[PDB]
Design a protein around this ligand. Structure first.
Ligand code: BR
Length: 116
């Protein structure tokens, strides 16, 4: 149901970080997914690749050696839905909760096939 390789986040100033979304990974699936990101949405807002800029307080993302940085501009109280599209991988949906200024990791999945 949940991804094994994306499990956590860090809080930054006006941003969060997914350290496991690593463009330098020896894990070829994580490396190819991260290198080949095509689109990031937060609560349906389209984010811009800021390349190497601070993402503080932006609708912006950066992939670098510390992971995937996301601005919190489009974040809301309660549930937040982050959708990462990539060339070779089904969309990844990360759910995070915001409460009293604090954001925590809830789930990371790709849409699943129903099995018995
Ligand atoms: Br599938």
């Amino acid at each position: 149901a949940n991804l094994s390789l994306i499990t956590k986040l860090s809080q930054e100033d006006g941003a969060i970080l997914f350290p496991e979304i690593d463009r330098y990974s020896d894990n070829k699936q994580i490396k190819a997914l991260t290198q080949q990101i095509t689109k990031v949405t937060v609560n349906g807002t389209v984010y811009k690749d800021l390349i190497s800029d601070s993402v503080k307080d932006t609708n912006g993302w950066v992939s670098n050696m510390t992971g995937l940085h996301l601005g919190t501009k489009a974040f809301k109280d309660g549930e937040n839905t982050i959708v990462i599209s990539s060339k070779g991988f089904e969309d990844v949906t990360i759910t995070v909760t915001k409460k009293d200024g604090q954001i925590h990791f809830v789930s990371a999945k790709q849409k699943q096939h129903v099995t018995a």
